Amino acid sequence: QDELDVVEGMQFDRGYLSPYFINKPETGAVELESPFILLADKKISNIREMLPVLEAVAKAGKPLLIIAEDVEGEALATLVVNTMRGIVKVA
Amino acid sequence: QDELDVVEGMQFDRGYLSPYFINKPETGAVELESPFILLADKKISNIREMLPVLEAVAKAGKPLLIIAEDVEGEALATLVVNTMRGIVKVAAVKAPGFGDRRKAMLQDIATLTGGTVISEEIGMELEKATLEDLGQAKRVVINKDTTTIIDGVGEEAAIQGRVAQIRQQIEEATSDYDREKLQ
Amino acid sequence: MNIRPLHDRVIVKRKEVETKSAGGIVLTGSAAAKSTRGEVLAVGNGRILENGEVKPLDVKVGDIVIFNDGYGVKSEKIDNEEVLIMSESDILAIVE
Amino acid sequence: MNIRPLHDRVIVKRKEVETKSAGGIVLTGSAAAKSTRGEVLAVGNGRILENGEVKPLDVKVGDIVIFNDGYGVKSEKIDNEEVLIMSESDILAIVEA
Amino acid sequence: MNIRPLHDRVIVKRKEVETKSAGGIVLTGSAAAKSTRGEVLAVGNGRILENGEVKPLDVKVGDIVIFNDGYGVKSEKIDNEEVLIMSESDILAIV
């Protein structure tokens, strides 16, 4: 039997590389309200000093979205552990 | 005559790197009662010092099983030499399968065995941890190739929660390859 | 108990890594950095060049100082924590 | 067994190897981190610096000390004894307990 | 703020980054463009050498100077500002 799907907004196929980014929404779906967007021209791995800029967003109680080519192992690990412990909501 | 075998609990087909793990049971049969299971992501060569964890288990005085990337021969020598000594019985195994999914199921085993989700690829350390993080199962039986658990110490509520989590993954979309393997 | 060093030899206890106040904790991992803080245990006698005899000691025990970021600082294993020993000339500044 | 060294050259025996007691029942592998300490067998004759000449240092025979292990020290099994000749700056810190 | 260097190595804080001067009308081009000016926070009393107890600095205190940005300068973060420790070899003309 056929099916129909309707999609609104910008949708593309990409998932979190670390399973620890499964946020408070489990069951395969993670819905986040009031997210915010960053767009950088370069891959974002080393410079981790931008944390306060997102910190003001996080401590106000609203998540953030990151669009980067890649994050290196250590910065990715500390971001993941920060999200897992609950310091910041990061997608 | 057909052969009927039942393999219950947790089992994986990996062999011990050191033959000296021949246990008290004859024919090299290996058995451990209520050991401590631990997870690691590194081959322990450079640090060469699990000794804080080793001595924590020694004062705990109970057998142990470790899962890691590998153990170098230098650490292997004392890890096997020390097991003889009778201080702590330690069983070391190779990674059963492909990285991400195998690690994912190791965490499921740890939850089953009462262990904690332990991945060295995050901010926590191998030697920096709490002794209760080690998971325990009543009996584990180990031979040259097969390692099996009869019954472990875990909450059935958490096991059923993981079952519910994996219910949708039973189907997924890959179908042929994913479905039967996951089931 | 303090191990007494010879002249121009300073022993300190390194201070553990502090997490930044930027965000809830926020911890690094296997990320070494210069020991900018440490507690001095003992100090060398000094320099005896041209019969230096006894020149005054630069610092007193209990002072928090900052020293050189060089490879010559040698770590040592003792009971409980380790220590770091360097030349008495390797101090860079005094905290406060 | 006691032959005199000179100036910075001081003669010391390196501390015990083969970890009989250094931590648990563990055995050291080929990777050796051992005998960072020593006990001095003797010290050199003394300094020579423009009539400052020889000034005895705070280390005398039999002192259990912590030293610097580097290329500056020469190790030899002589007089049926293992011995190491190291400089004045090769000593780190001394305590007898 | 209360960090006291002594002898040779003294503390100078870096001036403003991305200065307006470079490029003329346009701002400093963000391609390996490093200025060499900064103001000294504190200095030591002097250097003990050849029986001289103190080698007092002709260098003023708290004044901005030019500096040589080489290996001798070591930048450390105090109070969330980066200040460089180095001897008088790398400190250039007084401004």
Side-chain angles (χ1 to χ4, degrees), chain E residues 50-62:
Chain E
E50 56 261 10
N51 203 3
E53 324 295 336
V54 176
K55 185 54 186 186
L57 281 76
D58 196 3
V59 171
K60 217 174 179 179
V61 65

PDB file of all heavy atoms in Angstrom, chain E residues 50-62:
ATOM      1  N   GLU E  50      77.536  39.475  39.680  1.00  0.00           N
ATOM      2  CA  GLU E  50      78.884  39.945  40.021  1.00  0.00           C
ATOM      3  C   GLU E  50      78.880  40.832  41.268  1.00  0.00           C
ATOM      4  O   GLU E  50      79.271  42.000  41.248  1.00  0.00           O
ATOM      5  CB  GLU E  50      79.552  40.647  38.832  1.00  0.00           C
ATOM      6  CG  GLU E  50      78.801  41.821  38.216  1.00  0.00           C
ATOM      7  CD  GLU E  50      78.044  41.433  36.963  1.00  0.00           C
ATOM      8  OE1 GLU E  50      77.952  40.221  36.675  1.00  0.00           O
ATOM      9  OE2 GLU E  50      77.546  42.338  36.263  1.00  0.00           O
ATOM     10  N   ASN E  51      78.396  40.243  42.365  1.00  0.00           N
ATOM     11  CA  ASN E  51      78.375  40.860  43.690  1.00  0.00           C
ATOM     12  C   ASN E  51      77.394  42.026  43.760  1.00  0.00           C
ATOM     13  O   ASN E  51      77.221  42.634  44.821  1.00  0.00           O
ATOM     14  CB  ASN E  51      79.779  41.317  44.098  1.00  0.00           C
ATOM     15  CG  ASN E  51      79.938  41.448  45.599  1.00  0.00           C
ATOM     16  OD1 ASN E  51      79.018  41.147  46.362  1.00  0.00           O
ATOM     17  ND2 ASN E  51      81.110  41.897  46.034  1.00  0.00           N
ATOM     18  N   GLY E  52      76.745  42.344  42.644  1.00  0.00           N
ATOM     19  CA  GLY E  52      75.709  43.357  42.646  1.00  0.00           C
ATOM     20  C   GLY E  52      74.391  42.784  43.119  1.00  0.00           C
ATOM     21  O   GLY E  52      73.817  41.916  42.456  1.00  0.00           O
ATOM     22  N   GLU E  53      73.907  43.253  44.269  1.00  0.00           N
ATOM     23  CA  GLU E  53      72.700  42.676  44.855  1.00  0.00           C
ATOM     24  C   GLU E  53      71.482  42.929  43.974  1.00  0.00           C
ATOM     25  O   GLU E  53      70.676  42.023  43.734  1.00  0.00           O
ATOM     26  CB  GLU E  53      72.483  43.244  46.258  1.00  0.00           C
ATOM     27  CG  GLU E  53      73.773  43.475  47.028  1.00  0.00           C
ATOM     28  CD  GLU E  53      74.511  42.187  47.336  1.00  0.00           C
ATOM     29  OE1 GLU E  53      73.864  41.119  47.381  1.00  0.00           O
ATOM     30  OE2 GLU E  53      75.744  42.241  47.527  1.00  0.00           O
ATOM     31  N   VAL E  54      71.334  44.155  43.477  1.00  0.00           N
ATOM     32  CA  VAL E  54      70.187  44.547  42.669  1.00  0.00           C
ATOM     33  C   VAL E  54      70.691  45.269  41.429  1.00  0.00           C
ATOM     34  O   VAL E  54      71.614  46.086  41.507  1.00  0.00           O
ATOM     35  CB  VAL E  54      69.212  45.447  43.460  1.00  0.00           C
ATOM     36  CG1 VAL E  54      68.072  45.919  42.571  1.00  0.00           C
ATOM     37  CG2 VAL E  54      68.671  44.712  44.675  1.00  0.00           C
ATOM     38  N   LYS E  55      70.084  44.962  40.280  1.00  0.00           N
ATOM     39  CA  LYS E  55      70.342  45.664  39.026  1.00  0.00           C
ATOM     40  C   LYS E  55      69.069  46.416  38.659  1.00  0.00           C
ATOM     41  O   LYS E  55      68.273  45.944  37.832  1.00  0.00           O
ATOM     42  CB  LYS E  55      70.766  44.705  37.916  1.00  0.00           C
ATOM     43  CG  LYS E  55      71.155  45.396  36.621  1.00  0.00           C
ATOM     44  CD  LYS E  55      72.230  46.442  36.860  1.00  0.00           C
ATOM     45  CE  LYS E  55      72.509  47.243  35.599  1.00  0.00           C
ATOM     46  NZ  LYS E  55      73.658  48.174  35.777  1.00  0.00           N
ATOM     47  N   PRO E  56      68.844  47.585  39.255  1.00  0.00           N
ATOM     48  CA  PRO E  56      67.580  48.298  39.032  1.00  0.00           C
ATOM     49  C   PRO E  56      67.367  48.620  37.562  1.00  0.00           C
ATOM     50  O   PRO E  56      68.311  48.911  36.824  1.00  0.00           O
ATOM     51  CB  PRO E  56      67.739  49.569  39.872  1.00  0.00           C
ATOM     52  CG  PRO E  56      68.764  49.220  40.899  1.00  0.00           C
ATOM     53  CD  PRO E  56      69.712  48.288  40.213  1.00  0.00           C
ATOM     54  N   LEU E  57      66.108  48.555  37.142  1.00  0.00           N
ATOM     55  CA  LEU E  57      65.757  48.753  35.744  1.00  0.00           C
ATOM     56  C   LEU E  57      65.663  50.238  35.420  1.00  0.00           C
ATOM     57  O   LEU E  57      65.012  51.000  36.142  1.00  0.00           O
ATOM     58  CB  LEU E  57      64.425  48.073  35.427  1.00  0.00           C
ATOM     59  CG  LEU E  57      64.398  46.561  35.207  1.00  0.00           C
ATOM     60  CD1 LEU E  57      64.515  45.808  36.524  1.00  0.00           C
ATOM     61  CD2 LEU E  57      63.127  46.167  34.473  1.00  0.00           C
ATOM     62  N   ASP E  58      66.305  50.647  34.324  1.00  0.00           N
ATOM     63  CA  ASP E  58      66.001  51.950  33.746  1.00  0.00           C
ATOM     64  C   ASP E  58      64.594  51.967  33.170  1.00  0.00           C
ATOM     65  O   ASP E  58      64.050  53.044  32.903  1.00  0.00           O
ATOM     66  CB  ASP E  58      67.024  52.300  32.663  1.00  0.00           C
ATOM     67  CG  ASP E  58      67.017  53.776  32.298  1.00  0.00           C
ATOM     68  OD1 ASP E  58      66.257  54.551  32.915  1.00  0.00           O
ATOM     69  OD2 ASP E  58      67.773  54.164  31.382  1.00  0.00           O
ATOM     70  N   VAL E  59      63.997  50.791  32.988  1.00  0.00           N
ATOM     71  CA  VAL E  59      62.637  50.686  32.482  1.00  0.00           C
ATOM     72  C   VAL E  59      61.673  51.270  33.504  1.00  0.00           C
ATOM     73  O   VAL E  59      61.743  50.956  34.700  1.00  0.00           O
ATOM     74  CB  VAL E  59      62.300  49.220  32.174  1.00  0.00           C
ATOM     75  CG1 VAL E  59      60.824  49.059  31.850  1.00  0.00           C
ATOM     76  CG2 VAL E  59      63.171  48.701  31.043  1.00  0.00           C
ATOM     77  N   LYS E  60      60.766  52.126  33.039  1.00  0.00           N
ATOM     78  CA  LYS E  60      59.744  52.680  33.908  1.00  0.00           C
ATOM     79  C   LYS E  60      58.752  51.593  34.318  1.00  0.00           C
ATOM     80  O   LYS E  60      58.800  50.452  33.850  1.00  0.00           O
ATOM     81  CB  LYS E  60      59.014  53.828  33.214  1.00  0.00           C
ATOM     82  CG  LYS E  60      58.636  54.972  34.135  1.00  0.00           C
ATOM     83  CD  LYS E  60      58.046  56.129  33.350  1.00  0.00           C
ATOM     84  CE  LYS E  60      57.643  57.268  34.268  1.00  0.00           C
ATOM     85  NZ  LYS E  60      57.075  58.413  33.505  1.00  0.00           N
ATOM     86  N   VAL E  61      57.835  51.961  35.206  1.00  0.00           N
ATOM     87  CA  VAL E  61      56.818  51.048  35.712  1.00  0.00           C
ATOM     88  C   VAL E  61      55.459  51.508  35.199  1.00  0.00           C
ATOM     89  O   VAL E  61      55.145  52.705  35.228  1.00  0.00           O
ATOM     90  CB  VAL E  61      56.852  50.956  37.248  1.00  0.00           C
ATOM     91  CG1 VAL E  61      56.491  52.287  37.898  1.00  0.00           C
ATOM     92  CG2 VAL E  61      55.926  49.849  37.734  1.00  0.00           C
ATOM     93  N   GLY E  62      54.679  50.564  34.678  1.00  0.00           N
ATOM     94  CA  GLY E  62      53.337  50.856  34.217  1.00  0.00           C
ATOM     95  C   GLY E  62      53.244  51.571  32.890  1.00  0.00           C
ATOM     96  O   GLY E  62      52.148  52.002  32.517  1.00  0.00           O
TER      97      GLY E  62
END
